[PDB]
C-alpha cells in the first residue's frame, strides 16, 4: 500500500507584513517537493532523485500553484479572523493536509484543515459531505456546498492524484518499493545495587512503521516500558528504541520483540 500526501501551513504576522506559506509533499514516507514563501527565490524544488527529470515547465506549473494557494490562504485568515470576531494584533495558523491512498487500486482520499491547532473543517470519507467543528466552520460548509466544492476535490483525489502517484512509483521503484529491515542490538545500564535498564534498539529501517515490545518470560510488559518517538536518521531511514527497568540478576528472563514490514517474521532478542 502506497500514498501521496501534502501538508500546507500559513502563519499570519500582524504588523510584520503578509503571512508565511510553506508546503511539503510526500510519497509514503519519502518527501520530494517543497515551497517556502520566505525563501530568497520562492519556487518548488525537488527533494528526491525521481522528480529531478520532470521538465522545467512542469516545475512552473507546480510553482504557479504553490503561489496560488498562498494567496488563497491570505484571504482565509482574514475571513477566519472575522468569523471568530478576533482582534487584528494576533498571529494565527491555518493548516491543510490531503492525499490519496490507493492491489494497486484506489482506496480512500482525505482532506482536512485546522485553525490555530484545533480541528476546523474536513472532507468526509465519502468525499461528498463535510464535517464542521463549530458555527464558524458552518459558514465555510455553506459556501463549499453551494459552490459544489466537494466534487472538484473528488475529481483530483480519485483522478489526477492517483495518476501521478502511480507514476512516481515507477520512476523511483528502486527506493520507493523496497523495504529496509531494522538492525537491532541490546544494551544494559545498571542504575543502583538492584536495578538495571535494558534498551532494545531499532536502526536503519524503512518504512517508519514499527512495533517494539518487552516481555518477561513470554508475557507482555508495558507497566515499565519507556518508548520514544520514531525519529528520522536524516538519510531516508528511521530509528526507535524501547527501555525497560528490571531487577539485577533477572535480565536473562526478558525478551524484546520487533515487528516490521521488511522482516520475514517477528524478531526475538535477548541481552
Amino acid at each position: 500500500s502506497h500514498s501521496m500526501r501534502y501538508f500546507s501551513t500559513s502563519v499570519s504576522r500582524p504588523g510584520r507584513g503578509e503571512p508565511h506559506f510553506i508546503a511539503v509533499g510526500y510519497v509514503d514516507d519519502t518527501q520530494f517537493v517543497r515551497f517556502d514563501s520566505d525563501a530568497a527565490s520562492p519556487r518548488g524544488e525537488p527533494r528526491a532523485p525521481w522528480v529531478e527529470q520532470e521538465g522545467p515547465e512542469y516545475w512552473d506549473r507546480e510553482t504557479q500553484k504553490y503561489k496560488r494557494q498562498a494567496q488563497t490562504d491570505r484571504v482565509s485568515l482574514r475571513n477566519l479572523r472575522g468569523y471568530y470576531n478576533q482582534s487584528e494584533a494576533g498571529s494565527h495558523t491555518l493548516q491543510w493536509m490531503f492525499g490519496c491512498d490507493l492491489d494497486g487500486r484506489l482506496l480512500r482520499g482525505y482532506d482536512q484543515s485546522a485553525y490555530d491547532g484545533k480541528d476546523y473543517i474536513a472532507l468526509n470519507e465519502d468525499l461528498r459531505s463535510w464535517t464542521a467543528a463549530d458555527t464558524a466552520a458552518q459558514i465555510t460548509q455553506r459556501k463549499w456546498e453551494a459552490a459544489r466544492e466537494a466534487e472538484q476535490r473528488r475529481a483530483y483525489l480519485e483522478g489526477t492524484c492517483v495518476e501521478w502517484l502511480r507514476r512516481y512509483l515507477e520512476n523511483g521503484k528502486e527506493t520507493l518499493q523496497r523495504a529496509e529491515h531494522p538492525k537491532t542490538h541490546v544494551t544494559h545500564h545498571p542504575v543502583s545495587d538492584h536495578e538495571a535498564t535494558l534498551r532494545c534498539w531499532a536502526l536503519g529501517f524503512y518504512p517508519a512503521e514499527i512495533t517494539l515490545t518487552w516481555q518477561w518470560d513470554g508475557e507482555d510488559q508495558t507497566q515499565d516500558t519507556e518508548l520514544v518517538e520514531t525519529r528520522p536518521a536524516g538519510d531516508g531511514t528511521f530509528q526507535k528504541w524501547a527501555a525497560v527497568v528490571v531487577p539485577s540478576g533477572e535480565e536473562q528472563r526478558y525478551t524484546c520483540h520487533v515487528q516490521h514490514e521488511g522482516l520475514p517474521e517477528p524478531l526475538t532478542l535477548r541481552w
Binding site: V33, E62, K65, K143, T160, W164
Partner: peptide, 8 residues
C-alpha cells in the same frame, strides 16, 4: 502533483 482549492 499539487492542487489548489477555494477559500474558507
Amino acid at each position: 502533483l499539487y492542487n489548489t482549492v477555494a477559500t474558507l
